[PDB]
Design an enzyme around this catalytic site. Structure first.
Site, PDB file in Angstrom:
ATOM      1  N   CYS A   1       3.776   5.164   5.823  1.00  0.00           N
ATOM      2  CA  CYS A   1       3.794   3.915   6.609  1.00  0.00           C
ATOM      3  C   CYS A   1       5.218   3.432   6.744  1.00  0.00           C
ATOM      4  CB  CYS A   1       2.934   2.819   5.947  1.00  0.00           C
ATOM      5  SG  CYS A   1       2.886   1.251   6.865  1.00  0.00           S
TER       6      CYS A   1
ATOM      7  N   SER B   1      -5.799   5.263  10.160  1.00  0.00           N
ATOM      8  CA  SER B   1      -4.405   5.643   9.920  1.00  0.00           C
ATOM      9  C   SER B   1      -4.248   6.793   8.896  1.00  0.00           C
ATOM     10  CB  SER B   1      -3.583   4.463   9.410  1.00  0.00           C
ATOM     11  OG  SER B   1      -3.600   3.332  10.261  1.00  0.00           O
TER      12      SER B   1
ATOM     13  N   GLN C   1      -7.290  -3.005   9.857  1.00  0.00           N
ATOM     14  CA  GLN C   1      -8.508  -2.193   9.960  1.00  0.00           C
ATOM     15  C   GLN C   1      -9.517  -2.575   8.881  1.00  0.00           C
ATOM     16  OE1 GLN C   1      -7.867   1.169  11.997  1.00  0.00           O
ATOM     17  NE2 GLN C   1      -5.798   1.749  11.221  1.00  0.00           N
TER      18      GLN C   1
ATOM     19  N   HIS D   1       0.826  -1.207   0.000  1.00  0.00           N
ATOM     20  CA  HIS D   1       0.000   0.000   0.000  1.00  0.00           C
ATOM     21  C   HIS D   1       0.848   1.240   0.000  1.00  0.00           C
ATOM     22  CE1 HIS D   1      -0.358   1.360   4.477  1.00  0.00           C
ATOM     23  NE2 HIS D   1       0.717   0.610   4.346  1.00  0.00           N
TER      24      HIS D   1
ATOM     25  N   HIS E   1      -5.380   5.408   1.941  1.00  0.00           N
ATOM     26  CA  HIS E   1      -4.476   4.481   1.249  1.00  0.00           C
ATOM     27  C   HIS E   1      -4.786   4.297  -0.202  1.00  0.00           C
ATOM     28  CE1 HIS E   1      -3.989   2.528   5.341  1.00  0.00           C
ATOM     29  NE2 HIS E   1      -5.146   3.163   5.428  1.00  0.00           N
TER      30      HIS E   1
HETATM   31  C1  LIG Z   1       0.643  -3.043   9.547  1.00  0.00           C
HETATM   32  N1  LIG Z   1       2.014  -2.561   9.263  1.00  0.00           N
HETATM   33  N2  LIG Z   1       2.905  -3.232   8.743  1.00  0.00           N
HETATM   34  C2  LIG Z   1       4.002  -2.473   8.643  1.00  0.00           C
HETATM   35  C3  LIG Z   1       5.222  -2.871   8.108  1.00  0.00           C
HETATM   36  C4  LIG Z   1       5.271  -3.922   7.200  1.00  0.00           C
HETATM   37  C5  LIG Z   1       6.491  -4.321   6.665  1.00  0.00           C
HETATM   38  C6  LIG Z   1       7.660  -3.668   7.038  1.00  0.00           C
HETATM   39  C7  LIG Z   1       7.610  -2.617   7.947  1.00  0.00           C
HETATM   40  C8  LIG Z   1       6.390  -2.218   8.481  1.00  0.00           C
HETATM   41  C9  LIG Z   1       3.725  -1.269   9.143  1.00  0.00           C
HETATM   42  C10 LIG Z   1       2.461  -1.344   9.531  1.00  0.00           C
HETATM   43  C11 LIG Z   1       1.655  -0.216  10.179  1.00  0.00           C
HETATM   44  O1  LIG Z   1       0.685  -0.462  10.894  1.00  0.00           O
HETATM   45  N3  LIG Z   1       2.086   1.011   9.905  1.00  0.00           N
HETATM   46  C12 LIG Z   1       1.425   2.207  10.446  1.00  0.00           C
HETATM   47  C13 LIG Z   1       0.536   2.832   9.369  1.00  0.00           C
HETATM   48  C14 LIG Z   1      -0.539   1.847   8.905  1.00  0.00           C
HETATM   49  N4  LIG Z   1      -1.806   1.833   9.318  1.00  0.00           N
HETATM   50  C15 LIG Z   1      -2.436   0.841   8.700  1.00  0.00           C
HETATM   51  C16 LIG Z   1      -3.746   0.379   8.752  1.00  0.00           C
HETATM   52  C17 LIG Z   1      -4.128  -0.707   7.973  1.00  0.00           C
HETATM   53  C18 LIG Z   1      -3.201  -1.329   7.144  1.00  0.00           C
HETATM   54  C19 LIG Z   1      -1.892  -0.866   7.094  1.00  0.00           C
HETATM   55  C20 LIG Z   1      -1.512   0.221   7.874  1.00  0.00           C
HETATM   56  N5  LIG Z   1      -0.359   0.863   8.024  1.00  0.00           N
HETATM   57  C21 LIG Z   1       2.483   3.221  10.887  1.00  0.00           C
HETATM   58  O2  LIG Z   1       3.678   2.992  10.707  1.00  0.00           O
HETATM   59  O3  LIG Z   1       2.149   4.276  11.426  1.00  0.00           O
END
Ligand SMILES: Cn1nc(-c2ccccc2)cc1C(=O)N[C@H](Cc1nc2ccccc2[nH]1)C(=O)O
Length: 145
Positions: A95, A136, A113, A41, A139
């Site tokens: 992200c 968040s 989510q 994403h 996207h």
């Molecule tokens: C769910 N996830 N996976 C990673 C990730 C994956 C691969 C390598 C590094 C980080 C980061 C995240 C994450 O929650 N990131 C959040 C932002 C975010 N919010 C989300 C809500 C839904 C899906 C993905 C999303 N990503 C942040 O850093 O503030």
């Protein structure tokens, strides 16, 4: 038509197009559930984001409206072929997954989510979403497996 898709009429053109109200996809052409899916994403956060902070900016101050304009611009560039998804996600996603070219790896229902989950599970392999709104931020999603 597959889940979420509807046919509609563009007044300006006089031609039908299709849109998915789950993914917010839209296109002129006619399109065509596993345990797990794989998605990358690109997230653009805004000031009502749950965590209004990223690796890019310690404090995110853009309005939701502004983040929508940014997302719309990213979509336009991917669709024209000017930039490809992975590349814009690496440079611009708010992200922490930017460092993986936006890849989140595989997941099942329950994990992400709900609006993000539904969009991902509504896309087929290789397909791209329109703007999808979560707590968040906003996207674009690309289903890769
Ligand atoms: C769910 N996830 N996976 C990673 C990730 C994956 C691969 C390598 C590094 C980080 C980061 C995240 C994450 O929650 N990131 C959040 C932002 C975010 N919010 C989300 C809500 C839904 C899906 C993905 C999303 N990503 C942040 O850093 O503030």
């Amino acid at each position: 038509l597959p889940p979420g898709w509807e046919k509609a009429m563009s007044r300006s053109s006089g031609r039908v197009y299709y849109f998915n109200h789950i993914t917010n996809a839209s296109q002129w052409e006619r399109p065509s559930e596993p345990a797990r899916v794989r998605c990358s994403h690109l997230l653009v956060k805004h000031s009502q984001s749950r965590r209004p902070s990223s690796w890019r900016q310690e404090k995110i101050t853009r309005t939701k409206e502004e983040a929508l304009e940014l997302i719309n611009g990213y979509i336009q560039k991917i669709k024209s072929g000017e930039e490809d998804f992975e590349s814009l996600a690496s440079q611009f996603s708010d992200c922490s997954s930017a460092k993986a070219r936006g890849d989140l790896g595989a997941f099942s229902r329950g994990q992400m989510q709900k609006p993000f989950e539904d969009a991902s599970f509504a896309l087929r392999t290789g397909e791209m979403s329109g703007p999808v709104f979560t707590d968040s931020g906003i996207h674009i999603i690309l289903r890769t497996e």
